[PDB]
Amino acid sequence: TSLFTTADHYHTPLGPDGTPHAFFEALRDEAETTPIGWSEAYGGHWVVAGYKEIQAVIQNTKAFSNKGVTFPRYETGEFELMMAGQDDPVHKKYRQLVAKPFSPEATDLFTEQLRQSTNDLIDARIELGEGDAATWLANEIPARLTAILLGLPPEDGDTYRRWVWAITHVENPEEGAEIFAELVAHARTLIAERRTNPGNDIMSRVIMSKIDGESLSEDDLIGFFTILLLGGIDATARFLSSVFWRLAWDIELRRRLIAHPELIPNAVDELLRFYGPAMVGRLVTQEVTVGDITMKPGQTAMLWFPIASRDRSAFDSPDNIVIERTPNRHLSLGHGIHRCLGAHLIRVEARVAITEFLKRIPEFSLDPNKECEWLMGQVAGMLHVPIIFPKGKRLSE
Numbered sequence: 001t002s003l004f005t006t007a008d009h010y011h012t013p014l015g016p017d018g019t020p021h022a023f024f025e026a027l028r029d030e031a032e033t034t035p036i037g038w039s040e041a042y043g044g045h046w047v048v049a050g051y052k053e054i055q056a057v058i059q060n061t062k063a064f065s066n067k068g069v070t071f072p073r074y075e076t077g078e079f080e081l082m083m084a085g086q087d088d089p090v091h092k093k094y095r096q097l098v099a100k101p102f103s104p105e106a107t108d109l110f111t112e113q114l115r116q117s118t119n120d121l122i123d124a125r126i127e128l129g130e131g132d133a134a135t136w137l138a139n140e141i142p143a144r145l146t147a148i149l150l151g152l153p154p155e156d157g158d159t160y161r162r163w164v165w166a167i168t169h170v171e172n173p174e175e176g177a178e179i180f181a182e183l184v185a186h187a188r189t190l191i192a193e194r195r196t197n198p199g200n201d202i203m204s205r206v207i208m209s210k211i212d213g214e215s216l217s218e219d220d221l222i223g224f225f226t227i228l229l230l231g232g233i234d235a236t237a238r239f240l241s242s243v244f245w246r247l248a249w250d251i252e253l254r255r256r257l258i259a260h261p262e263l264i265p266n267a268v269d270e271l272l273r274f275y276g277p278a279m280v281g282r283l284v285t286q287e288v289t290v291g292d293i294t295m296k297p298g299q300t301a302m303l304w305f306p307i308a309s310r311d312r313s314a315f316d317s318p319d320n321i322v323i324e325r326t327p328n329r330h331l332s333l334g335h336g337i338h339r340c341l342g343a344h345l346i347r348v349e350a351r352v353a354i355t356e357f358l359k360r361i362p363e364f365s366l367d368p369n370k371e372c373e374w375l376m377g378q379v380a381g382m383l384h385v386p387i388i389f390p391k392g393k394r395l396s397e
Ligand code: HEM
Pocket: 066, 069, 082, 083, 084, 085, 091, 095, 146, 227, 228, 231, 232, 233, 235, 236, 239, 276, 277, 278, 279, 280, 281, 331, 332, 333, 334, 335, 337, 338, 339, 340, 341, 342, 343, 345, 346
């Protein structure tokens, strides 16, 4: 028997802790013998689990196209995924338009604003002694910031999350497509308003941009809106949720981050290795051999970053969260020409979220009377993290 044969990133066996990590560890073990295996899920596809094999695939853009970046394809109607779903030279020209606002200096401008935001969110339940850390904090910190980056109302996160749910999970394809069309209607309204009232936000920037002398089409602009909203609120929320869950029970990790706040950036990087939500696909466009396996045009390869992030030939003691680990060249943010546009931004969001939360609520635990829930898929992580804690005091009021 092989664990590859029924591997499916939307249906990962969960262990007694509520995560897929026992299964990932078992697949990692098998991958030492077979780093690429055939799964019969989704009609048949390749699962790439070894670290060096994922590196080989993700560097080989001639044979492995980002037209397959989501598999099964995300529900975005007739729209492509902007940047993420493109190959060069097209990909590079679109990404250049938004490189500046995602640079470390540009995103660092939001640091203290994120800190204030995080504290305002914590104020809403600190006097109560209980909350779902995912819905209360993890969902809201990145959704509010993303809203501000796109010039959306930050208070409407439930609307934005409903759109993303349709893109990533709704099973009835008519329904999912209709809800995605709601996002598209709102994007058109936003774009029309920005045209007349341009600001310093990222949508105004791409609206005023040109490629090869031509303004972007309304469709390309909707594409930018979609990928930035999607990227900004989904994997960030799942990652932060998984982190709050881990900190709720892992009292040893928690006390160390309180004692050594200077280690929080490196610990965020290690938590990205361990809880990185993402996997990505590639469409095979030319016959290619990777290790023992020859892939053929039209096949899809899924890059199982969480398994490669646990590869013993790439990391010492990969099953331990070693907060001082360097260089820690994990693949949770990708590698090569598509490497995550939001990399620096999530590092800042996570550092601030963890720092302020542990400052405000150093003592907390999982609620024994409510269930946690792990969401599976191409972006995976805790969805519900009910916690309890001693009642504390609001900063504002
Ligand atoms: C925990 C948080 C996140 C994780 C794990 C993550 C993961 C990734 C990964 C693995 C890729 C590579 C795609 C590939 O190789 O096909 C990627 C690309 C990308 N991400 Fe992120 N992402 C995160 C947050 C963000 C945020 C905050 C944004 C923007 C607000 C964002 C926007 C993008 C975009 C636009 C791409 C495509 C870049 C390109 O194609 O050149 N992501 N992300």
